[PDB]
Enzyme design. Structure first.
Site, mmCIF file in Angstrom:
data_model
loop_
_atom_site.group_PDB
_atom_site.id
_atom_site.type_symbol
_atom_site.label_atom_id
_atom_site.label_comp_id
_atom_site.label_asym_id
_atom_site.label_seq_id
_atom_site.Cartn_x
_atom_site.Cartn_y
_atom_site.Cartn_z
ATOM 1 N N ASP A 35 14.409 7.384 2.165
ATOM 2 C CA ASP A 35 13.651 6.596 1.195
ATOM 3 C C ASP A 35 12.357 6.106 1.849
ATOM 4 O O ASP A 35 12.361 5.086 2.565
ATOM 5 C CB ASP A 35 14.491 5.408 0.757
ATOM 6 C CG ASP A 35 13.763 4.560 -0.275
ATOM 7 O OD1 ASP A 35 12.743 4.992 -0.784
ATOM 8 O OD2 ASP A 35 14.269 3.448 -0.549
ATOM 9 N N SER A 199 -4.902 8.046 -5.330
ATOM 10 C CA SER A 199 -5.182 9.338 -5.932
ATOM 11 C C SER A 199 -6.568 9.315 -6.584
ATOM 12 O O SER A 199 -6.988 8.244 -7.098
ATOM 13 C CB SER A 199 -4.091 9.668 -6.980
ATOM 14 O OG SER A 199 -4.387 10.798 -7.720
#
Ligand code: RDY
Ligand code: NA
Length: 330
Positions: A35, A199
């Protein structure tokens, strides 16, 4: 040193991935959920409340010649999905894919929430976010990656998740055979303890690319792609009959649909998520309503590039002095 381990979907939907991990002496092999959005290595154990264990493999520290109680240390964690676990702490030897760390904090669960009990395939979590998020008190502990780092050939690990197929976690090297083209690297902020990046924008299907900054985290422990409501609405508007449901808690769509791809930007480069990756199947067995793999991050307080996005790429987690992420197509 290096390590290399195969990671396998837990089910036909890629709801999570499990990777075998050796703990203790002689080895006890547990299948852990790696994770990148958390920083605790915790396991089902001989200490876990018996009614909360249903099929998981347990770690038994009393059978490990190298286990030591980390006296006075406790831990307690809550995840973004509402699940939780807590317990006490041992140090032991932990190996992943041939890479060994001695003295790793292995957090032994005394209690787990119902979602963990109900998932017989996941024996615990191995956190790969920054050690600043580790929950051990009173002495915070390091992640497996942070303890391994100085020994590694290169201070990196890579995630290469499969679509309905096994993939790979590598530590200490970048497998130049595992991706196509070149890797584009992008800046990381560690301020919230995550692999947080920005992004450069998105496209829906064959549509034009929208240049827009989207700040989010690279999180292998989250199944879906969670993005701003504007972006998510623009995606699902291209699917006839798709709608946000509250009764279901997210966008659903006709199981008869063919889904468009979704592209996200990494600098000037582009990662394309095929439409099939966005199909999470019937909302309930036999339903003709299907659950979407792109959902709104509204109310979650962060955008999350979970497995839907990461599995479309070869992802480099660069833990050098100034951390970075890299993304390549594959
Ligand atoms: C030159 C740079 C860019 O996009 O401007 N680039 C191509 C690039 O990969 O930058 C990676 C990087 C980010 C933060 C700190 C060190 C390295
Ligand atoms: Na679900």
């Amino acid at each position: 040193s290096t390590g290399s381990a195969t990671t396998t979907p837990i089910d036909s939907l890629d709801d999570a991935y499990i990777t075998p991990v050796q703990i203790g002496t002689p080895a006890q092999t547990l299948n852990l959920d790696f994770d990148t959005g958390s920083s605790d290595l915790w396991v089902f154990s001989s200490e876990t409340t018996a009614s909360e264990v249903d099929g998981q493999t347990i770690y038994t520290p009393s059978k490990s010649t190298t286990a030591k109680l980390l006296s006075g240390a406790t831990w307690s964690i809550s995840y973004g999905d509402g699940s939780s676990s807590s317990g006490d702490v041992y140090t032991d030897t932990v190996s992943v894919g041939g890479l060994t760390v001695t003295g790793q904090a292995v957090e032994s669960a005394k209690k787990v929430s119902s979602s963990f009990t109900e998932d017989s395939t996941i024996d615990g979590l191995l956190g790969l976010a920054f050690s600043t998020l580790n929950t051990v008190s009173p002495t915070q502990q390091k992640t497996f990656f942070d303890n391994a780092k100085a020994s590694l050939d290169s201070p990196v690990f890579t995630a290469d998740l499969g679509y309905h197929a096994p993939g790979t976690y590598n530590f200490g090297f970048i497998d130049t055979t595992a991706y196509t083209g070149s890797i584009t690297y992008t800046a990381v902020s560690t301020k919230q303890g995550f692999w947080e990046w920005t992004s450069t924008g998105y496209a829906v299907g064959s549509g034009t690319f929208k240049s827009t900054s989207i700040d989010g985290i690279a999180d292998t422990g989250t199944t879906l792609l969670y993005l701003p409501a504007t972006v998510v609405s623009a995606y699902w508007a291209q699917v006839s009959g798709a709608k946000s449901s509250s009764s279901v808690g997210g966008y659903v769509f006709p199981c008869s649909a063919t889904l468009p791809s979704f592209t996200f930007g990494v600098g000037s480069a582009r990662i394309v998520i095929p439409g099939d990756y966005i199909d999470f199947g019937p909302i309930s067995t036999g339903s003709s309503s299907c659950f979407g793999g792109i959902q709104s991050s509204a109310g979650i307080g962060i955008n999350i590039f979970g497995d839907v996005a990461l599995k479309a790429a070869f992802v480099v987690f660069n833990g050098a002095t100034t951390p970075t992420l890299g993304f390549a197509s594959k």
